[PDB]
Amino acid sequence: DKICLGHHALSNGTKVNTLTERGVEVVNATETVERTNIPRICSKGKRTVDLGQCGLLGTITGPPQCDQFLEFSADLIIERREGSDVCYPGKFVNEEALRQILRESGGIDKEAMGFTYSGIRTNGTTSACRRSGSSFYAEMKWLLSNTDNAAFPQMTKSYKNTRKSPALIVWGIHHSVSTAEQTKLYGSGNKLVTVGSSNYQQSFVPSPGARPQVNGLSGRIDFHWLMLNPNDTVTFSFNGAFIAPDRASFLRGKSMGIQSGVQVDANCEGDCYHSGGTIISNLPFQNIDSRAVGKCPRYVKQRSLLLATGMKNVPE
Amino acid sequence: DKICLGHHALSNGTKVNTLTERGVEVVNATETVERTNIPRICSKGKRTVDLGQCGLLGTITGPPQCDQFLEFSADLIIERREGSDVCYPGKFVNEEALRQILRESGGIDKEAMGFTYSGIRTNGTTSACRRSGSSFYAEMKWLLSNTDNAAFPQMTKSYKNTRKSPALIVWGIHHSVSTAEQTKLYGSGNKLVTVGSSNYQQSFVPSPGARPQVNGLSGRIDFHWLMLNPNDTVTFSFNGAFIAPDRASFLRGKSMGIQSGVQVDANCEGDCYHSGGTIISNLPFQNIDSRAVGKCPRYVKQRSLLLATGMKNVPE
Amino acid sequence: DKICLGHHALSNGTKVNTLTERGVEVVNATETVERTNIPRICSKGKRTVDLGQCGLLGTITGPPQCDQFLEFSADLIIERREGSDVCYPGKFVNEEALRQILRESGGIDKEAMGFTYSGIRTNGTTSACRRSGSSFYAEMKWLLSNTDNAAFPQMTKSYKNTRKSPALIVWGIHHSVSTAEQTKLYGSGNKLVTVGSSNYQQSFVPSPGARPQVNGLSGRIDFHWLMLNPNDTVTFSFNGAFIAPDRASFLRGKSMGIQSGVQVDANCEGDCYHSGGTIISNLPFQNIDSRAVGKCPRYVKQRSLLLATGMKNVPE
Amino acid sequence: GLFGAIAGFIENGWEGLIDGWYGFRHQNAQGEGTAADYKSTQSAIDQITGKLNRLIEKTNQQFELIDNEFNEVEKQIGNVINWTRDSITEVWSYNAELLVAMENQHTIDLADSEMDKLYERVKRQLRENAEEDGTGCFEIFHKCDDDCMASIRNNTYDHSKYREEAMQNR
Amino acid sequence: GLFGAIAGFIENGWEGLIDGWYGFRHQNAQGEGTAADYKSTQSAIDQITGKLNRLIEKTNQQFELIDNEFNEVEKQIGNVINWTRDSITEVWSYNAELLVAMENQHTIDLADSEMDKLYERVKRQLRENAEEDGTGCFEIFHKCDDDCMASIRNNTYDHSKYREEAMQNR
Amino acid sequence: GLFGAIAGFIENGWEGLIDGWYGFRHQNAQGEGTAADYKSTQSAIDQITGKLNRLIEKTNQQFELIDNEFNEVEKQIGNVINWTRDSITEVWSYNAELLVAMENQHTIDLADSEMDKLYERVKRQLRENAEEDGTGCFEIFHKCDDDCMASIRNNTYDHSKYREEAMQNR
């Protein structure tokens, strides 16, 4: 007698939100916000450099913890909490900018600056940079006056950049414990250092005085840097207080830099990283970490946003 | 004979915009962009501190106008145009960063730094900080040499942070009218001050010379600051020119900071503020002020965006 | 016997994307992403100033290449790669901020500062600023000591801003090749310069030393600036090393600034510019240059996004 | 709208219908009358109110000051801030404009369909006892007294009890 | 589309119909002919053009340079700027892609419905004088000369004047 | 939904229909049976999967660190960064919420229409050999054996071969 049309249904649907309705039940639905983290740095197929105890800025200056990182090559660079940029206590001026450069550098190649010295010492060392006995930053030279209280002569040193990519130049400035220690090291009087390239002008007079004993030492070393362009020349006028660059750094190519506290894993591949690990997902959004980096789903504040993949559920 | 289906209508609808049409008339509509301002700061239920003539940075140093704000507590902090951070003319280095910290501080608690001094004066005052006769910043000490033209000895002062939250440390630097006034105050010669904590290195040599008579005075005081971490120590080497912190500041919790020129009102509650008052609304957008702060509707450029809440109007 | 309803169609449609489908063919479609560039700066109807060899910051100081730009007026300002801000080698502190101010200035009007000098020279010149023989920056004065090695006295100079808009004040600092050249110019000893306005405090001690021969010269001139408010006064204390402003700059109104390497064209009108030219379009999006400026279509990464303007194509 | 009822095959709306959104207007031997359909009306109201519930809210996300109205921040950082704010303003102004236009398109169509759904409901109730006018009316062959009309309105109308007499009038 | 007419119960479109978007193709004793419906065609064109009017514009909002192509800004601020610009680019690329796909979905469905609305209009005009074919055609019982066909097209066709003869052919 | 079939004139869904999304349930002298319609089912599945293909992806756009979790950046720049990130988070949270709600509205309606399109297909196949029940059923005058029912399902049913006997039962 009769023929009837109908549609499938379940006893119990999945609730989703629409333009007009909160919590309408549908036959099937799926998640659009990723919540699953992988608690490893998934680095399958990538040249990875885990800096460990080496601080990223220490790869340019070379404290003992960074000896195996002086010319690293990488697609992915991992900074660790235990990293330290320094052996002799000190810090870099414009430090975060420099970390950002080095994170995407592809790693670094090193080249001799070509400085020679006459009328001064060049081999200043210390207890805090330990290589079986006292030492110093592997890429740097601590310039002193020939002997205690001797006049450190006014000096003029050049380096031209004969390569086709910008050279990263780093130099330091020493801050002795005393005002009397500045005289012993480089002779008494106000010392001046200046730096000049096509688009750079800056000068630094030292500032002695006591500081807290870091690494058992109360002195500090300032660290400074600029990018010297191809065919550009850079000049260093100095009367003392000055830590001379031995080598220049050139950037290799391209990389991605992350900070993290979890283990490397070459068994999984991922392109979205955060400190707690790797977000592997095809979903358009994620609610794990708003500071995730790489190629990531967009961060949203919602934990879940279900997308209907079936008709509305209208049970018996 | 017949039965007819129909729908309601009005003689005159409300015009709205659609995907295909500008100005289609509908039965009813409602506004989505808020234009109604309340010309008061609606602070019902909130611990509110209206700084009035006290400048927000003056709560850390304590000029006379800020005497009642040295240890305030707040959910909401209001800066006024008439506010002044200084009594003796001067300004802070990194000032806006510090205001941003203090705006969300929840207010401040003060603690003795614990400095003692031997071989120098400690009670420098002036006409511009009036507390029935001359005075000075309530939280600071103006350090001088024992007598006119006397040698201000090289000094080394420490403060450890024994609490579990970062301590805000503030100190000043004086800039006398003359080069001769610098010698009278702290003795002749170039004076050096330096500061060193785990992640901080900076030095300041003074700079005397004449300036415009502000508050009738042509001298200036520099103000400087850093956040000293828990269990970290901070050292001050100084030969003079230096304004010593007596107390350190600790931040209480959380607050919201606003700038405004209208009255406080404890009769209304709001969470979105701008200089002209409070935006109280459930609407998703507002066209009052793009720099409104708190928890606000999103600012849009349109004055009005009507949302249809009825069918299309098709009159007789 | 029968009447049939139908719709038009073509043998071959235009593929577009929908919510459910990639590459569905429709009867007609149109592009929403602009890809057509015009390789000129389309400036019909606009007061245009093409700086050419004049650097934008050079309009404030006046090297010979900028002689015809000392008081320009403009709606549109064009910077060129061949532009130079300097004749005597040097650079500005806070340079990009100043370029941003000048780009939207509407151009500049110049006014005498009103400085007189007693006990010093005022007419220092050089080989690198050529106006048929040696010269100097047209808006500046190179202050020297009366004669070689003579004491440059400590000096105190004021300028009040009696106009209703902020005055841009520029001054320089010289960095001679030698430490001996600093003594010849302004007498031996450490020279100090300071600057003080209602909301400004800064000081600059010079820094001699050798630099690369730019324009055949190894000296450098620092350039410095602040915005002096209406009815505010600014003071310059100086012992030497100092390049004095002759005139102050006032901003005229409003303009738009661009950098470009293509020709001006008064035959076409446009409001969206980039270095390669002008984007003339009514389309909502563009895929030419993400750094385009003016009033532009939004930059998107896609080269093309076709919008259906006809029904789906369902051919025989 | 899409369903071609409102501003479609129904010529126009009724200004006298103050009782609901949709309704019936009959004409028989006892005269004309008009009554509002609750179900259809309520279904449209509920969908529209659900839109409002969704849209009428701001977020719990707090934003603080990053610049200063009494003491201008440094120019470079200030210009970056202004550029960023203006960019964000441009996104929200677009979002707001597009949201409202899309919603309004859907609201109008949604009301259109509810009208159509009521129309088709009644057509189905009447079976072969009536025929479509084309203007939004059903001409009824057999005799519907005011009782009859109320049975249609209240979904109780039995087509088989008037079928033959209506069929005979083919 | 949603209304199941275009690429639905109508097998396909006519390539010979260059006169409008929609139309009638008849077949009688006098032969076959085809004619475009203005009203339906115009209603779809007007809705589509209204979309374009809305979409084809940029804003009056000016943006200025915050970085420098000839003289690189400081690296830190430069990276913040680039990050911000790239973030904004990502929002607009999404907005643009979603806008176009949503509009295109609606445009296709909108055209589908206009086809359906024309189909239902005619069905209602013909009353009991015709029956649905199922392919988008109405088989007519009584004899429609070219005059008759034009009356249907122009909305003047009176069903009662051919009813009995069409009914008798049931 | 908009088309008034699912959660509309069809009272409810069938929990026994595990074969497809849509289907026929018949009742004749040989008893009751139920079978899934492939075409309608597949058309809805294909549209829904096409949505997923569009939506299930992230972009190839890389973002790098602009701040530092181990060594806090300067406060001013840090606050600008946080403000910018939070502003962007607010845009995407909105985009995500609106996208899903809009898609879900369309998905539900899309399924509703496919149900309706199947319903109208069959109505058209049956011609004057059947009449609408109103609950989603077609009462058939003439005698449909299980063969007959399968002809309707498979689109082969010829209305003219049972017409008179069905018509005679008017």
Ligand SMILES: *[C@@H]1O[C@H](CO)[C@@H](O[C@@H]2O[C@H](CO)[C@@H](O)[C@H](O)[C@H]2NC(C)=O)[C@H](O)[C@H]1NC(C)=O
């Ligand atoms: C950033 O934009 C603000 C406005 O949003 C600018 O401040 C305004 O400047 C105009 C013109 O000088 C004044 O009329 C207003 O009083 C100012 N309003 C506010 C709220 O400050 C500000 O100048 C811009 N910043 C920069 C660096 O150009």
Ligand SMILES: *[C@@H]1O[C@H](CO)[C@@H](O[C@@H]2O[C@H](CO)[C@@H](O)[C@H](O)[C@H]2NC(C)=O)[C@H](O)[C@H]1NC(C)=O
């Ligand atoms: C910010 O991005 C711009 C491009 O949008 C970078 O500038 C480009 O750098 C590449 C590689 O060095 C050059 O090939 C181009 O000539 C540059 N284009 C422009 C328009 O300047 C810039 O380096 C980025 N900024 C930072 C700090 O990394």
Ligand SMILES: *[C@@H]1O[C@H](CO)[C@@H](O[C@@H]2O[C@H](CO)[C@@H](O)[C@H](O)[C@H]2NC(C)=O)[C@H](O)[C@H]1NC(C)=O
């Ligand atoms: C910017 O926001 C970040 C978080 O996104 C702030 O850093 C967090 O600070 C809280 C409270 O001190 C700590 O509990 C977390 O450990 C921090 N998280 C991270 C990832 O750093 C940061 O302080 C904010 N920046 C500024 C200048 O306020």
Ligand SMILES: *[C@@H]1O[C@H](CO)[C@@H](O)[C@H](O)[C@H]1NC(C)=O
């Ligand atoms: C439905 O029924 C119960 C909750 O009452 C639960 O066990 C089951 O998982 C539910 N299924 C779904 C799809 O919600």
Ligand SMILES: *[C@@H]1O[C@H](CO)[C@@H](O)[C@H](O)[C@H]1NC(C)=O
């Ligand atoms: C329901 O959706 C999920 C996605 O979460 C999918 O994998 C699965 O195949 C679907 N299940 C059914 C029975 O359709």
Ligand SMILES: *[C@@H]1O[C@H](CO)[C@@H](O)[C@H](O)[C@H]1NC(C)=O
């Ligand atoms: C450092 O170098 C000088 C060279 O002048 C040499 O006399 C001295 O012994 C060296 N000291 C050490 C510890 O190598």
Ligand SMILES: *[C@@H]1O[C@H](CO)[C@@H](O)[C@H](O)[C@H]1NC(C)=O
């Ligand atoms: C640098 O100079 C060399 C010649 O020594 C030349 O080959 C090269 O092209 C120059 N590079 C640039 C960027 O001008």
Ligand SMILES: *[C@@H]1O[C@H](CO)[C@@H](O)[C@H](O)[C@H]1NC(C)=O
């Ligand atoms: C309609 O009629 C007049 C304008 O002609 C005006 O008084 C009335 O407010 C209007 N109402 C609406 C809802 O637009």
Ligand SMILES: *[C@@H]1O[C@H](CO)[C@@H](O)[C@H](O)[C@H]1NC(C)=O
């Ligand atoms: C029309 O909309 C407003 C919102 O602006 C609402 O408050 C009011 O109840 C509505 N009026 C009617 C008659 O529905």
Ligand SMILES: *[C@@H]1O[C@H](CO)[C@@H](O)[C@H](O)[C@H]1NC(C)=O
């Ligand atoms: C300041 O302190 C010194 C303590 O050495 C004292 O001699 C002097 O009288 C004090 N002056 C004032 C005004 O209190």
Ligand SMILES: *[C@@H]1O[C@H](CO)[C@@H](O)[C@H](O)[C@H]1NC(C)=O
């Ligand atoms: C600071 O040192 C004290 C011991 O004096 C210890 O209790 C506390 O945990 C330390 N805090 C941190 C952050 O290391």
Ligand SMILES: *[C@@H]1O[C@H](CO)[C@@H](O)[C@H](O)[C@H]1NC(C)=O
């Ligand atoms: C359709 O046919 C051919 C490609 O096969 C080509 O010549 C013609 O331009 C095409 N037209 C469109 C509108 O795609």
Ligand SMILES: *[C@@H]1O[C@H](CO)[C@@H](O)[C@H](O)[C@H]1NC(C)=O
């Ligand atoms: C098709 O679209 C274009 C826009 O690209 C328009 O200019 C043209 O008039 C349209 N052509 C036809 C035949 O409708």
Ligand SMILES: *[C@@H]1O[C@H](CO)[C@@H](O)[C@H](O)[C@H]1NC(C)=O
């Ligand atoms: C510069 O000015 C001084 C004025 O004291 C004058 O003696 C000298 O000749 C001038 N030199 C030149 C080259 O104009």
Ligand SMILES: *[C@@H]1O[C@H](CO)[C@@H](O)[C@H](O)[C@H]1NC(C)=O
């Ligand atoms: C500046 O002072 C003059 C009086 O010399 C006065 O006319 C003017 O209003 C003042 N401007 C401001 C901004 O206070």
